[PDB]
Structure formats: structure tokens, C-alpha cells
Write a protein that binds this DNA or RNA. Sequence first.
RNA 1: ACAGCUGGUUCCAAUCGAAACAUGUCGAAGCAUGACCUCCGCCGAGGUAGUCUGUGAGGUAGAGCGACCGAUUGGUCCUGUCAAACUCCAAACUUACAGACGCUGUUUGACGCGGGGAUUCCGGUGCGCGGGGUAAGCCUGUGUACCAGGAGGGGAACAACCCAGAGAUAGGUUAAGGUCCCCAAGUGUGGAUUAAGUGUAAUCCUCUGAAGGUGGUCUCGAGCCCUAGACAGCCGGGAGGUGAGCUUAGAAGCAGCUACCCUCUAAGAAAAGCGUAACAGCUUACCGGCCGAGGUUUGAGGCGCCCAAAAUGAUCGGGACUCAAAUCCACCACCGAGACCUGUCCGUACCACUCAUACUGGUAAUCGAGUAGAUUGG
RNA 2: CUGUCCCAACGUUGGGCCCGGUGAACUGUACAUUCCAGUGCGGAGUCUGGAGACACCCAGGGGGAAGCAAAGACCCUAUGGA
RNA 3: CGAGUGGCUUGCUACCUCGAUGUCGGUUCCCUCCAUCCUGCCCGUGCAGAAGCGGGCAAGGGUGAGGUUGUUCGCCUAUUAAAGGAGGUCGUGAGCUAGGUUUAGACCGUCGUGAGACAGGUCGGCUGCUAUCUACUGGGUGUGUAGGUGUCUGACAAGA
RNA 4: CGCCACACGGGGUAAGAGCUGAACGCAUCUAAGCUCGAAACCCACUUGGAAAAGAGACACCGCCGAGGUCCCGCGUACAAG
Lengths: 142, 337, 172, 160
Amino acid sequence: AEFDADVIVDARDCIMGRVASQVAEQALDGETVAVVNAERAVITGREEQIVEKYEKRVDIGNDNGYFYPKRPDGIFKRTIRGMLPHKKQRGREAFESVRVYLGNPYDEDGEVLDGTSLDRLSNIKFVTLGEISETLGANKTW
Amino acid sequence: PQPSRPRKGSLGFGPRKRSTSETPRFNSWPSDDGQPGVQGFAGYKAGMTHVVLVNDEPNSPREGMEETVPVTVIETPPMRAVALRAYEDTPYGQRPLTEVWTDEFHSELDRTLDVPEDHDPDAAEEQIRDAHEAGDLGDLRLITHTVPDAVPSVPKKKPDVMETRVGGGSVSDRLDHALDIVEDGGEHAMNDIFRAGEYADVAGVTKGKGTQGPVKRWGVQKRKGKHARQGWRRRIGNLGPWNPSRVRSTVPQQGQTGYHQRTELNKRLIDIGEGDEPTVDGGFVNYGEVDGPYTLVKGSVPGPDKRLVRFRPAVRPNDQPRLDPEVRYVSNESNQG
Amino acid sequence: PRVELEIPEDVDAEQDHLDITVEGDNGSVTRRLWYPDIDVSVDGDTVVIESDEDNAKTMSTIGTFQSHIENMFHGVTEGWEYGMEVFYSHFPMQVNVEGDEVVIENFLGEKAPRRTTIHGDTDVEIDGEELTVSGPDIEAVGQTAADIEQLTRINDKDVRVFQDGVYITRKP
Amino acid sequence: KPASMYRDIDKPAYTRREYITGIPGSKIAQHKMGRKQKDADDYPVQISLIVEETVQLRHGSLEASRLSANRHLIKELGEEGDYKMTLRKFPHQVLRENKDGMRAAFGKIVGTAARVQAGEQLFTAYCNVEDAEHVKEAFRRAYNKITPSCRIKVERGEEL
RNA sequence: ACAGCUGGUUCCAAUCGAAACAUGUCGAAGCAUGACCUCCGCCGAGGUAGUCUGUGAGGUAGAGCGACCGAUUGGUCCUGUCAAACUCCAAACUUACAGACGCUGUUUGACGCGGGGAUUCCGGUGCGCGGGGUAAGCCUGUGUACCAGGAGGGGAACAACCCAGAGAUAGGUUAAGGUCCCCAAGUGUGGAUUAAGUGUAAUCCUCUGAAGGUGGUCUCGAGCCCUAGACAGCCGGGAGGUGAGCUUAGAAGCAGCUACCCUCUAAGAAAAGCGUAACAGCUUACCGGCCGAGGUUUGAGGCGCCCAAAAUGAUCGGGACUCAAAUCCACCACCGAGACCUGUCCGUACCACUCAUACUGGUAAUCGAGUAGAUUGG
RNA sequence: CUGUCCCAACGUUGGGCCCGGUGAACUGUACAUUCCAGUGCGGAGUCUGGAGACACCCAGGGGGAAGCAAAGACCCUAUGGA
RNA sequence: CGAGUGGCUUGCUACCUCGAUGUCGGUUCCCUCCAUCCUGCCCGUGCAGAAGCGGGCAAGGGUGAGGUUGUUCGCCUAUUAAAGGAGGUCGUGAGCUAGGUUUAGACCGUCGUGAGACAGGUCGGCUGCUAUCUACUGGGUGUGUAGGUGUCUGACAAGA
RNA sequence: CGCCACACGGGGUAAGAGCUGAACGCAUCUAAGCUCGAAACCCACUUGGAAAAGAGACACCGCCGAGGUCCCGCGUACAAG
Ligand SMILES: [Cl-]
Ligand SMILES: [Cl-]
Ligand SMILES: [Cl-]
Ligand SMILES: [Cl-]
Ligand SMILES: [Cl-]
Ligand SMILES: [Cl-]
Ligand SMILES: [Cl-]
Ligand SMILES: [K+]
Ligand SMILES: [Mg+2]
Ligand SMILES: [Mg+2]
Ligand SMILES: [Mg+2]
Ligand SMILES: [Mg+2]
Ligand SMILES: [Mg+2]
Ligand SMILES: [Mg+2]
Ligand SMILES: [Mg+2]
Ligand SMILES: [Mg+2]
Ligand SMILES: [Mg+2]
Ligand SMILES: [Mg+2]
Ligand SMILES: [Mg+2]
Ligand SMILES: [Mg+2]
Ligand SMILES: [Mg+2]
Ligand SMILES: [Mg+2]
Ligand SMILES: [Mg+2]
Ligand SMILES: [Mg+2]
Ligand SMILES: [Mg+2]
Ligand SMILES: [Mg+2]
Ligand SMILES: [Mg+2]
Ligand SMILES: [Mg+2]
Ligand SMILES: [Mg+2]
Ligand SMILES: [Mg+2]
Ligand code: NA
Ligand code: NA
Ligand code: NA
Ligand code: NA
Ligand code: NA
Ligand code: NA
Ligand code: NA
Ligand code: NA
Ligand code: NA
Ligand code: NA
Ligand code: NA
Ligand code: NA
Ligand code: NA
Ligand code: NA
Ligand code: NA
Ligand code: NA
Ligand code: NA
Ligand code: NA
Ligand code: NA
Ligand code: NA
Ligand code: NA
Ligand code: NA
Ligand code: NA
Ligand code: NA
Ligand code: NA
Ligand code: NA
Ligand code: NA
Ligand code: NA
Ligand SMILES: [Sr+2]
Ligand SMILES: [Sr+2]
Ligand SMILES: [Sr+2]
Ligand SMILES: [Sr+2]
Ligand SMILES: [Sr+2]
Ligand SMILES: [Sr+2]
Ligand SMILES: [Sr+2]
Ligand SMILES: [Sr+2]
Ligand SMILES: [Sr+2]
Ligand SMILES: [Sr+2]
Ligand SMILES: [Sr+2]
Ligand SMILES: [Sr+2]
Ligand SMILES: [Sr+2]
Ligand SMILES: [Sr+2]
Ligand SMILES: [Sr+2]
Ligand SMILES: [Sr+2]
Ligand SMILES: [Sr+2]
Ligand SMILES: [Sr+2]
Ligand SMILES: [Sr+2]
Ligand SMILES: [Sr+2]
Ligand SMILES: [Sr+2]
Ligand SMILES: [Sr+2]
Ligand SMILES: [Sr+2]
Ligand SMILES: [Sr+2]
Ligand SMILES: [Sr+2]
Ligand SMILES: [Sr+2]
Ligand SMILES: [Sr+2]
């Protein structure tokens, strides 16, 4: 489905939380952001502990519910939601004008935001979002 | 320190509510091993009878001897595969692409569907082939319906429509096999997919029992001894502890029992035939007389008589196939008596 | 730091990002040498492993990258050969190579055959009571030979009495 | 009883025996060990066990750490070996226990403890150059049986 | 009926503003008399919350005891320890009086005196010093500031922790705290450390984490060895007199006893460790060679790791963060209260004028929070 | 001897459910769709942080409202009573 | 001898509740913890084998029936792979039970001049309520997405 | 109380067994890398699930007519619905 994006962001080799922090700030300023290649987005640290944290969130829940996403599609969306006052009017409008995607559905290349890019030649202790999703049990469709 | 005991009833068939479709819907299909073919069939439950059979298992001490085996008679007349649906591999899973229909429609099909008058089967076929060239074609399934009119004991003439997967060799060869079945009139029988002795998976919407208490619904105890005479007979002890201050959905409570979909695994097909051979004297109670294409399923089958059941080649068999068992006797004795 | 390794005349060395392909007469081996701030490049005739950092963790891996590259040189020229001998006390053991895997039958009197898959382009050759595992990739040969010794593992009974099994005799 | 109940200096100095009665005797057998007839200056090496934290060490803890320290020297250098160890601290602080709820709470006398400040030498050994590594192991066993962390400081010995 | 016991007791505003303590009490759920709050009248020039100096009082901390006293080691003077009810010593500090400076009072009358009215005598917390108790969100003192009766800003929430004491309205600048998003302000600068998501937790019932351990890693130093080739590895040599003597059937490097001697030489033990019934066998010492650059030993510091087990759903508030959005050392720029500055207005007090407490003009850096209660105008 | 129990089933009668008519009471500071943790006079639907949550209605068995009903019978206290 | 963790035992305190938060044991039904009894995979042995003994990972599942006793605990029997422990207001009385504790009747022993007492024993001895909110189990009606029929997809959710 | 049905196998790990391997010329299962390995984890399998607010997809019928409701005879359904 078509989405009139102002800013198209390439998450490839980029630190998730840092991209998320900027995307939320832009969404509140009225921008229509679209995070692309989220499966290839990165999160620094020891894989084993990162997965433990995300697996605990999948195990947590009850009758009221704690729906935690397994796909990198939704994991990124939830990370952005946590940086937004989503229950307020202004924050919900900001959130609904931000959409994360698997790959790139557009014709344009996404712009790599400043200070978010991770140098692979200087780092080995990190995980890709797709790698977390595969361990969580999500069906690989990318 | 108060003895341990497994909880009352399973939590895997939840929520225990009424089924959306009376027509069963398979959630899994067999692998692509052999030659191209339709991965399922459907029929209408008739009733039960026993059969005398010769033991087929080589590991059994009683090999060759006469064994009495219970059997459910299911009337399985030829169905019609009216169309071929194609799925595409989108980043959000499998989504339907297009459908290739026919010209030859069963007279009584307009009781469920809005029958196609103007369709383009060639352009739709091309769309599926471009998707195959692009390498984005998911799986190929056939829209199928039954002919309840061919069954005299079943009151309905309104066809039961369901989708069934085509599995087999390569994606190119099974696309063509699917199109061939459709183009004719879609007419196929139980013989085309199944052979006697094969293990099938039977799915059905169970016998409706309305609202029932925890004892019947979850298999909890009745109040014992002195506790049975105080004003509480078939009600559970407590709805939960003080803390958490809420009732958990895991505690056995009242509600809908029956009319749920169940998929009974590894059902041996004793015999497939056509005639009045499995019929009971005086007719099957609350059904009628069987004189046509049938199947004899070993043991029980979910749902009551007249209900539509579905077949699928076993996705998880334990034993190796022992084809065409020797049926020495079929009981024709009255189910009344 | 910087360490230069001269490639032998029999050898050809190429590079694709972090991957290094080393070719020769006994075959070809491709390895991925990735570590923070360590750049491994082919300077036409020599292989250079250099870094701007001199810390213990960086130095550890520079030394590891050296041995890995030098081993690929030996592998594509001379090759890697591990020698093995089969021993049995009561039951005649049948050690055979069936396709892409080495099978061990009637081990310690078992009815069920013990099997393990051969790693890479490694070749296991049987000569009655002696076995010789060989190939260009030390990782693949070292493991395939190890896998065979491990295949006859016994945890339930005393290993000193029940000594049956294939063992490594020669390590290169 | 655990040393958690007595390790800290939080009560006043309670040592005055002319006002305190029924005080249990010290479990400490000897204070001067080894060759007590010989002088301390007759030895080249002098190593002390320095207590890092200010504490109260019970007589039973003092005897356990003294016994396991000297017993190692008796094993490695012999029963009449050429060494002389000294425990310079004496258990002067009298300890109570309230063993009725909190009414008339003043405890009955249960034992004694030695008040040792931080940086102080609890044990001080005097040995020869060959027996310097045997005495470092005697103090390594001794520090495990008292409450604080310790330093094994070599005071008079540039033989390394 | 009485009750020292519970509950309730109705309009506005202005000024001041407690005590939860002492003595006595069949008193401890209550009173009385004091302390303390308030109002009125009198008196008429001093006053003393701070500091400095002078003249005095003092034995707590610390310390020490061949200075008393009582504890408490060992050796053939020397040597090892202590004290709430010890002291040859001895503070900081508290305190009496006076002088000086400061501040204050003489129309705002201080200091003080007399009289009327109370309330109060369940307190609590933080910090310092305590005493009891294993400990306690424990019990019981003391000094002090706060809550009670104290707003507003910060701390996720949160009486007493930080900023801050506050008339209304308005502009501005800061305080504590904070500047990646949620969220106002930095994805700031120079530099280093950490790989554990350690950590992102001032204080705390609340934020644990210990003894012990750590070739995890960073940094600083000391001794020794080294191109006359160090450290390690690998190769070669590790020889005879003789298989030492005694012991013994035997013991021949290697059961035990004693000695532990000298040739050859570049080394090679009367043998350091396995091995054999005893031999034999494999190695260590020691020497040579190949190789080629620092190596080895010890001391100290920083951050981390191990030690580390709990009950409905994990957490630094959350998101999440790794040359940081952590930590430590400096630095730069900002955000951020009702505080501070500033305009106008109000109340109250005082001054000038006045019959006035009606106007008008003036002063307040040294006026403006408040439960019980005293006083007063409406 | 037997359904007390293993271990529960089927049935019978009156209710229960729907319709006409009749028609109360208990209870109500307010707000109120909650759940998990935290915090707070240490036992929170309402405070903090998150999670979840479209509204209304029917039937149910009673987990919570430290549920409703009773100015605790127990304990101590009062210069109470009998 | 020294250092800790837990919050299951007991004790301490008196913060919360005296215009009442029903109480031991049991029962019934649900969730959980791991310091693991069995089952899976491992290391060591004073590991021949068989059978053990000790240790590690691990909480998916299981851990049952009975004789005395109100008992919890425990003692005992026969089975068993094993017949583990603990938290949830010592989970659970607007669920049950009333055997115990805990009134008013009575007896015995002990104590008391006596009325009477007992942290002794013994027989008997009462258990209210029509669910407003919330919570969950199942069942409907609407609105949203924006003409209809049929077929599906799968974010998430549950399972032993 | 009767009868029928309820895997195997993948993937990633723990404890553990190892390979290659350096810091530390040797050695070393670990520091980077890799092969294995639990009834436990994920998938497999069953059940629910367009109210998933990114509120979905496909095909055909239809917008003056497709379809639906009421009505009528009944149950494979059912306390009302
Ligand atoms: Cl959930
Ligand atoms: Cl919000
Ligand atoms: Cl890294
Ligand atoms: Cl019961
Ligand atoms: Cl003030
Ligand atoms: Cl994290
Ligand atoms: Cl007025
Ligand atoms: K109470
Ligand atoms: Mg019959
Ligand atoms: Mg019959
Ligand atoms: Mg007033
Ligand atoms: Mg006024
Ligand atoms: Mg002193
Ligand atoms: Mg008050
Ligand atoms: Mg901002
Ligand atoms: Mg942490
Ligand atoms: Mg209640
Ligand atoms: Mg009362
Ligand atoms: Mg009484
Ligand atoms: Mg009287
Ligand atoms: Mg464990
Ligand atoms: Mg054995
Ligand atoms: Mg469990
Ligand atoms: Mg109990
Ligand atoms: Mg209870
Ligand atoms: Mg209850
Ligand atoms: Mg009751
Ligand atoms: Mg009731
Ligand atoms: Mg009785
Ligand atoms: Mg009784
Ligand atoms: Na991160
Ligand atoms: Na979840
Ligand atoms: Na009743
Ligand atoms: Na007492
Ligand atoms: Na009275
Ligand atoms: Na009094
Ligand atoms: Na009183
Ligand atoms: Na003056
Ligand atoms: Na002091
Ligand atoms: Na008082
Ligand atoms: Na104040
Ligand atoms: Na605040
Ligand atoms: Na963390
Ligand atoms: Na007042
Ligand atoms: Na009956
Ligand atoms: Na009323
Ligand atoms: Na309830
Ligand atoms: Na009376
Ligand atoms: Na503890
Ligand atoms: Na307790
Ligand atoms: Na209670
Ligand atoms: Na009970
Ligand atoms: Na388990
Ligand atoms: Na019993
Ligand atoms: Na209760
Ligand atoms: Na009870
Ligand atoms: Na009751
Ligand atoms: Na596996
Ligand atoms: Sr910004
Ligand atoms: Sr289907
Ligand atoms: Sr499905
Ligand atoms: Sr009853
Ligand atoms: Sr609660
Ligand atoms: Sr104290
Ligand atoms: Sr210690
Ligand atoms: Sr004083
Ligand atoms: Sr920055
Ligand atoms: Sr920096
Ligand atoms: Sr608390
Ligand atoms: Sr430590
Ligand atoms: Sr005012
Ligand atoms: Sr005022
Ligand atoms: Sr004031
Ligand atoms: Sr009811
Ligand atoms: Sr554990
Ligand atoms: Sr076991
Ligand atoms: Sr019985
Ligand atoms: Sr007992
Ligand atoms: Sr219980
Ligand atoms: Sr009773
Ligand atoms: Sr009586
Ligand atoms: Sr009694
Ligand atoms: Sr709306
Ligand atoms: Sr491992
Ligand atoms: Sr929809």
C-alpha cells in the first residue's frame, strides 16, 4: 500500500535505537518517516544477552496481554513507539505517520542519518534484527 | 503435602468456543515428495459398523489371523474442482494472487456462490506464469466443492466449498496438473487421491453439546462425600487464590462444549468402494441407506451423521503403509437392537 | 603493527572484502578473517595483516591470522595429512567410506552403524587397518579426523578396559 | 555464633574486669611461638600480617588463625625450626549476648575480642631467607580465618 | 445520671504565632504549676543571635601509663598488649564576665516590670555525638535543622534528601537538577578506560553484594638477563674410573646408611624426576647447535570478571544506548522555580500633613508561608 | 449391605432460561475498561512507570473490591457497670 | 574459624488494621519458584561388568494408594521411574468440611478457704447475604475499517 | 467401565566432548573462528485469530438491483440471541 513519505530512512548497518530516536523527533515535527531495510538494522552488544532480553519479552504476558513483536518489522516500530507519547493525541498522530518496512518497497534509496551508521570493520559484537527474529521463531519472509 | 495431579483438560484446543465454519479448514498440508496431485478430499459421515480383517503388520504375532475392527462409514461421492488459486510470496506471508475458473458449473452451485458469467482464464493463467518466472510464486491450491445432491440421506443441496492444496514435483509441472483437472469439469474421486490401507487425517466440526458445566467440559471432579450434600454437587472448589486478584482463563469454567474443529490424526482407510456393501439393516440410525461411493475409516471420526468431514494424507504417520487390506466380512446388522 | 607474509611460487592469493581465497596445486581454501580494526590485504606478492591498535586483544588475533594464512599456504601446496589406526579387542569393526560419510559397523557389538559426515573437500582413505585423512583446509581435515576419534566415544563404561575405536596416530 | 554479631566497633570499650564478672577464658594457648629464647634481631627477614579494615577479632577466631598459621610452620620447618612468630594482640574487649524480649536487655557475658585498627600488624614473624616463602603461605592460611582482608608486608628484607 | 472516653460544634479578612518539654498529682487517654504563644498597661536607654581579644571554668576525643589504678605477654634489664566506672598529659569545643566591631533600640520604646487570654505536656525525621539490642521502618537520650503547621522547582511516584521559604500580575536571569527520544536544552569539545548491557542507582526499609579468587584488559615503577645471541621451542650431546662403599641373594642415579671424591672435555650429578624383582628404558640438571629480539622476576594503581539461588510479567521511570546515551579527567555552550533582578498594583507597619484611623506625599535590603491559640476590622 | 469412594453416567419432579401480569430489598463520597511491577501509614481500579483496552447487552461460577451485614466477642485502657 | 544468600522455622519490634481483613488441619481448582526426588544430557570414582557413590546442566512432564493420629509433621505397609521441597493473606469458608482451637452445660486430676483457675485431659455444642463494579469462562447486538457472496491470509495467542 | 487417534525429523544452545588457534616461538576447547551436544529453547503439529487503526488478500456477482431480513417446514444448532 502507498505511503506518501517525506523522509525515507535506510536502516542498513545502522544502530536501531539511534535511528529510532531521530525518527520519533522528526515524526513529532510533522514528518512522514519510512524506515526501510529493518531486517538489516543493527543493535550492538553480546548476541546471547540481547536475545535473552528479547526472548523474555516474548515470554512475558497474561490474560490482559503483552503483545511483543517477533518480526524486525514490528520490533523497530515498537522501539520508535517507546520514544513517543503514543497515548496522547499528538504522539499517536506522529506514530501513525511512521511505518517500518522489510527491504525497500520504494524506487528511491533511503538516506543514512548522521551518527547512526555502524562500521563493520571496527565492530564484531553486534546482531542484525533479522538474526534476532530468526531466533525468536519468526518465519523468514525477507 | 497434598498429592500432585495433572490439570483438568488440555489448554491446546482453546478458546473453547463455537466454530466459524461448519466446513473444516486444514491448517497444514503434506510435503512435496511424489508426483503432482490434490492433497485432500471430503465426504459426509454416515454411521458405524464393524469389519473382520486380516492382520497386515509383519511385527504383529497375529499376522494372517482374523481381527475385528470398528469402522466409520463415510459417503464420499465425486467432488468438483471449479478453480485454481495461486499464492504469491509477499513480505507479509502468503497472499492470494489470481484464480482460474471454468465454464462447466454444477446446476446447484448458485446456492452458495455468485457463479462467474464473464471471466478471463487465459490472462489469469498468464499472471500466475509471470509470477513463476519472477520467482515469487508461493503455492497452488484448488477451490473445490461437494455434491450433497448425490447423497440422498443429506438434506442439503447447497455445496460445501473448501480450498485444497496441490503438492508434488516441481512448481511448473504441478501448475499444469492443476489446470488440467480444472479445465474438464473438475470431477475427481476418492480413488484419484487415496488408496485403501493409507493413513489419512480426518478433520471435522464435533457434535454440538451446547453449554455444559466444568465436569463434562473439563473433566473436573464432582464434589465427594459430605461435600456433595451441602448444596454444591458439580461446581469447582475455587476460581483462584486471593492473589492474583483475578480469575485466570486457565481455571475450568462453564461454556460451549462441542461444535469445535478437530483434526484427528493417522486414520487408516480400510476400504474405498461403491455400492450397498457397508449399509446397515433398516438404515443407519438418523441418517439413511448407503448406495454409492464410500470410504471405511478405522475407528471414530469427529462430528455427527450428515456432517461434512475432510481427508488429508497423513502429515505425521508412525507406521509404514500396508496397502489394500483383506476384508473378509462387513457387518450389515441393524444398528437398532 | 604490521606483519608481511611472502606467498610461495606455487601459490596464488586473492581477496574479496573480508574473505581470502588461497589457490595452489593441491586445491583452494577460502577463509573469512574478521576482527576489529585488523586489515588483511594482498599487496601483489605479499599478504599484509596490519592494525593501528597494539593492545593484547588485537595482537592475539594478528598472530592467529598469521598462522591461519601460513597454514593455507602449506595446505594448497603440500597438504594436511592426519594418520589413524583402528583398534578392537573382541568385535571385528568395519570402518568404511560410504559416499560423503565414513561409517563404522559392529562397534563394540552394536547392531546400529555409527556414522559421521566428512567436512569439505577432505578425503579419507582406508588401507585395511590404517586410515589417512587428507586435504588443503586444515579446519576441515583437523575436524574430520577428530570426528572419527569422537565417533567411538564411550561414557557409560570404563574406557581403560573398553579401548575399542579409531585413534589419531600422526598429527602434521 | 557468627562474627557478624561482633566484628564492628559499635559498643563502648568494655574491658574493666573489676566491674565485669563471669568472663570466659581465652582460647589462645600461646602468643610467642617458635624459638622464643632467641631474639627478633637475630633474623634477616621480618614479615607481618597487616589488617586492612578496623575490626574486633574474637579469641576463637584468633586461635584458629594462629593455630593454622603456626601448624604450617611446624610442618614445613619442623617442630624446633629456626623461626619465631608473635601474635601481638590480646583479647581485652568483653562481649555480651542477650540470650524476656527487649525488657532488661543488657546481655550476659559470652566471650572476648581484640580491637584492631586498620594498618595494624596482627601477626609478625621473623625467619631466614630460605623460609620466607613458607611464612607467606602461613599468613595466607591465617587471613582466611579472620574477618578482614589483609596485606602480607615484608618489612626487613631486600632478598628478592 | 456521670465519664478524664469517641463523634460533631455553621460567615469574611488583617497582625502575631506555639507546645508535643519540666516539677507535682491513685498520675501517666487527665489536671495543676512552669517553659513556650498572644494581648494590654507601666518603665525610659540600653540590648547581645555573630566575631575578635582579655580574665576565668572544664577532663570528652586523642594519647599514655619506670604517672596512680586494674587489666594483660614471653625470655636469660629486654620484650607483647589494654581501660564507660584509670590519668603524668590533653584538644577541637561548650561556657561566665568585660571591652571592641557588628547588628539592634531610644515617634517601630528595645532590655525590663505588672496584668488578661490561651494552646500544649501521644510527636516524628535527617545529620552529629551517643547508651541498650544480632538486628530492626527497634527502644531510650542529646545538639541541631526540618515535617507536623511549609508552598513552588528537582528526585519516576514519595511528610521531613537537594534547590527554595511564598501577596497579585508581568518581563527577565538563574538554583537544585538536567541537555539521544519520551521531555525544555548537546546525539558538545579534548583525552583515556570498560565488553560486563558492567553501567545509565547522590541520600535510601527502598539503590545490595562479601570473604576468597582472577596470564580479562589498561597503566606506573623496581631488580636481573640479552646480538660475546637472552626467554621458549626443536636437534645433538648428556661420556669414563665405577655397576661408588657400606647394606644385601641382589640394590648397579634413584629401598636405607655414609661419603658425595677426579679423568676426559664444550658439557654431563657418587643423580633432580618417572621406571624395573634387580637390570633396561624415558627424561632433569649441565654443554653445544638451529633460530633471532627483547626476555624474566617482583611492587602498585584503574575498569571489568568469578564468587551470585525464589516464587503472577524482566528492567536504569521507560525506550534504548557500546571511540556511549557508561566510567574517570578537564573544558565549552545551553535548558531549567514562585528563588534573584525589574514595571504596575494590594495588604500591613512606620514617617510627614490632618480631628481622622478621610485624603495626599514618603520609607520597608533589613515587611508579606502557617496547625492549636491570642488580638482586631468587616 | 451399599454410588461414601474408585468415577462418574442416564433419568424423574420443581426451579433455573424465554413471554404476559405483579413487583420489593440489601447497597451507593466521588470517579471507575483494567493488568503487571513499583511506590505510599509497610496489604492501590484511582499515585509512578509500562502493558493492555471500540461501545452495549445475555448467561455463569464467585478471584478481587483487605465485598455486604454488626461503633470487635479476643487483648489492653477507664481513679466504667453488674 | 571466616564470608554470605534466602525469607520456609523460630524469636524480636509494635509501622498497618480493634465503627472486625473469619482461624488449624483437610479438601477442591488455578499459577509459580529451584536449593532437582524421577525422567534427558553430562563430569569424576576407592569407574571390569551389573549395582552404586559424588558432582554439573536442566523446572518439559511426573512425583501416586493406603493403617494409627484433627493433626501439619511423623511413624508404618505394599506398590513405584520416583513416590522432591517451597511461594501464592502459613493461595483457597460472599467454595466445602467442623475433627481440632475458641463461649454458654458436665466430669476427672491438680491448685484455691471460696467464688473459681489450669497455655492438663474428656463428652456435647450455631457457619448470614437476591453480585452494583471489577475479573475471567462462554453467548449476542452495534459502531469502525467503507454494496454483496464465497474462498483465504496470519500479526499475534494457547498447548504437555 | 467401551472404541479410535496423539511422531519422526530439522535449527540454535546449556553442562560437557573437541577442532583450528594467538596473546605467550611451545602449550592451550577460547581470546577472534569452528564441529558437536539435554526430556529443556525455536520450528515441526493442533486450536483461536481481519478490531492486526498499516483495521488485510483473491475471485466472481452487483449499484434498480446482487444480496439480505421477515415469513413458512425443520434441525448436523441451540438457555435469549
Ligand atoms: Cl500475553
Ligand atoms: Cl503517552
Ligand atoms: Cl566488537
Ligand atoms: Cl469435594
Ligand atoms: Cl518563612
Ligand atoms: Cl540491554
Ligand atoms: Cl473587610
Ligand atoms: K482488626
Ligand atoms: Mg445399538
Ligand atoms: Mg445386539
Ligand atoms: Mg477568618
Ligand atoms: Mg482586613
Ligand atoms: Mg579512648
Ligand atoms: Mg498536627
Ligand atoms: Mg529536545
Ligand atoms: Mg544491572
Ligand atoms: Mg472477605
Ligand atoms: Mg468498638
Ligand atoms: Mg473478657
Ligand atoms: Mg464492681
Ligand atoms: Mg541449578
Ligand atoms: Mg556401572
Ligand atoms: Mg513448570
Ligand atoms: Mg502450619
Ligand atoms: Mg491460609
Ligand atoms: Mg474464599
Ligand atoms: Mg461462610
Ligand atoms: Mg453465600
Ligand atoms: Mg471427635
Ligand atoms: Mg469437642
Ligand atoms: Na545496544
Ligand atoms: Na509476549
Ligand atoms: Na446451601
Ligand atoms: Na518478661
Ligand atoms: Na463517671
Ligand atoms: Na504525666
Ligand atoms: Na485519663
Ligand atoms: Na555594642
Ligand atoms: Na572519635
Ligand atoms: Na510529651
Ligand atoms: Na519551619
Ligand atoms: Na516531585
Ligand atoms: Na542493563
Ligand atoms: Na490560625
Ligand atoms: Na445415586
Ligand atoms: Na435505601
Ligand atoms: Na467474586
Ligand atoms: Na454481671
Ligand atoms: Na540474609
Ligand atoms: Na518473621
Ligand atoms: Na486475613
Ligand atoms: Na484451611
Ligand atoms: Na521439571
Ligand atoms: Na496417614
Ligand atoms: Na482466606
Ligand atoms: Na478453612
Ligand atoms: Na462457613
Ligand atoms: Na538439537
Ligand atoms: Sr534533537
Ligand atoms: Sr483450508
Ligand atoms: Sr493456522
Ligand atoms: Sr452445610
Ligand atoms: Sr491484590
Ligand atoms: Sr551500638
Ligand atoms: Sr578474610
Ligand atoms: Sr557539652
Ligand atoms: Sr555526544
Ligand atoms: Sr570522548
Ligand atoms: Sr518497602
Ligand atoms: Sr572481592
Ligand atoms: Sr500573607
Ligand atoms: Sr501571615
Ligand atoms: Sr515571617
Ligand atoms: Sr448467580
Ligand atoms: Sr538455575
Ligand atoms: Sr537423575
Ligand atoms: Sr480408613
Ligand atoms: Sr509431634
Ligand atoms: Sr497449600
Ligand atoms: Sr465442634
Ligand atoms: Sr464449663
Ligand atoms: Sr485446656
Ligand atoms: Sr470512531
Ligand atoms: Sr562450549
Ligand atoms: Sr476489517
